[PDB]
UniProtKB/Swiss-Prot annotation:
Name assigned to this protein: C-type lectin domain family 4 member K
Outcome (variant: A103P): Significant reduction in mannose-binding ability; significant decrease in thermal stability; increased sensitivity of sugar binding to pH change
Gene name of the record: CD207
Subcellular location: Membrane
Organism for this UniProt entry: Homo sapiens (Human)
Quaternary structure annotation from Swiss-Prot or TrEMBL: Homotrimer.
Effect caused by changing K116A: Loss of binding to 6'-sulfo-LacNAc and 6-sulfo-GlcNAc
Residues of the full protein shown: 198 to 325 of 328
Length: 128
């Protein structure tokens, strides 16, 4: 059921999980919760999500609580500013340390509690 886009395969889950149980599921399938590194990848993802919320690989790291990607893609704060929903990350209830795709827009991301269950998206490299 994996979808192909620019050198990577993507799995849009049918069952919801917490952010970490989701990441574990991806890791069991030789993948990670997806990073997003271009406007065209953001577009591919939110369009495919069809208006439902999906965990992606956004999570906090370091003392300062900077956002990071679980697949170890360096997080580019400047290049990613345009990808959040206006007002996000707002850190609601001071407990929103993971990120999902929420709005069908280039401005798509929301921070939500890691322990909430959502559908999720895995990303796996194609290696010829
Ligand atoms: C009202 O709470 C929700 O909406 C806000 C934005 O208004 C979001 O910032 C907030 O993360 C989200 N909460 C959950 C649980 O997803
Ligand atoms: Ca939020």
């Amino acid at each position: 059921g994996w979808k192909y886009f620019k050198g990577n395969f993507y799995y849009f889950s049918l069952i919801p999980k917490t952010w970490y149980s989701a990441e574990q599921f991806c890791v069991s399938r030789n993948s990670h919760l997806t990073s997003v590194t271009s406007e065209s990848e953001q577009e591919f993802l939110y369009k495919t999500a069809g208006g439902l919320i999906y965990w992606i690989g956004l999570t906090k790291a370091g003392m300062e609580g900077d956002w990071s990607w679980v697949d170890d893609t360096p997080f580019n704060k400047v290049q990613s500013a345009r990808f959040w929903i206006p007002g996000e990350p707002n850190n609601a209830g001071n407990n929103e340390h993971c990120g999902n795709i929420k709005a069908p827009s280039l401005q798509a991301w929301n921070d939500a509690p890691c322990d909430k269950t959502f559908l999720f998206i895995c990303k796996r490299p194609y290696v010829p």
